[PDB]
């Protein structure tokens, strides 16, 4: 395992993140759905306050999920374009040449997400496999100055406090699905 084909190490590495990224999805989706259930439970107990703040969490967890489906995709995208990834060695290349196919918008973000998503430890492997293809400077140029990192990404990683409106709107919806009678403060 010394002089083995890049194209291979990368294909297996990505394939991994996918497998785990989806696992996190299935698990957190089911987990979040059971939280919704409990949210309704708190309504049927006049615990208005404890049902409010609780939902705020429901949002951040739901937003996290989104960030996963998005990272999933970004990988799959790269996995296919593996052949095209092997023909790169400088930043200039990826930057102003593979921006239409989304190769850049995908790899750059994934590396950023490393710190923020710890349920897919294997992601870090990609950062390392970048110096293997480019350098150790590229990675630091992302984790630090998120150069060309999608807006929706950086934002779903550290989601801003939930808007009062969205919360109330959420509660009202959880009620129209489980029961409850009075959703006050709307």
């Amino acid at each position: 395992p010394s002089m083995i084909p890049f194209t291979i190490k990368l294909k297996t590495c990505l394939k991994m993140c996918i497998q785990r990224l989806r696992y996190a999805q299935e698990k957190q989706q089911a987990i979040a759905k059971q939280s919704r259930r409990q949210v309704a439970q708190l309504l049927l107990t006049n615990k208005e306050q404890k049902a409010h703040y609780r939902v705020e969490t429901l949002i951040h967890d739901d937003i996290h999920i989104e960030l996963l489906e998005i990272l999933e995709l970004y990988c799959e995208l790269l996995l296919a374009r593996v052949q095209v990834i092997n023909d790169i060695s400088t930043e200039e290349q990826l930057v102003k040449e593979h921006m239409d196919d989304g190769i850049n918008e995908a790899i750059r973000s994934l590396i950023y997400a490393i710190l923020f998503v710890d349920e897919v430890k294997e992601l870090s492997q990609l950062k390392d496999l970048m110096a293997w293809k480019i350098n150790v400077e590229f990675v630091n140029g992302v984790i630090a100055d998120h150069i060309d990192v999608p807006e929706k990404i950086i934002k779903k990683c550290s989601p801003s406090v939930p808007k009062e409106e969205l919360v109330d709107l959420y509660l009202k919806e959880i009620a129209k699905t489980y029961d409850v009678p009075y959703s006050k403060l709307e």
Partner: peptide, 17 residues
Amino acid sequence: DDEKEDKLAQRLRALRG
């Protein structure tokens, strides 16, 4: 019921878009 919470979730997300 059972399949009612499924759509609920489906509608939730879009509701934040």
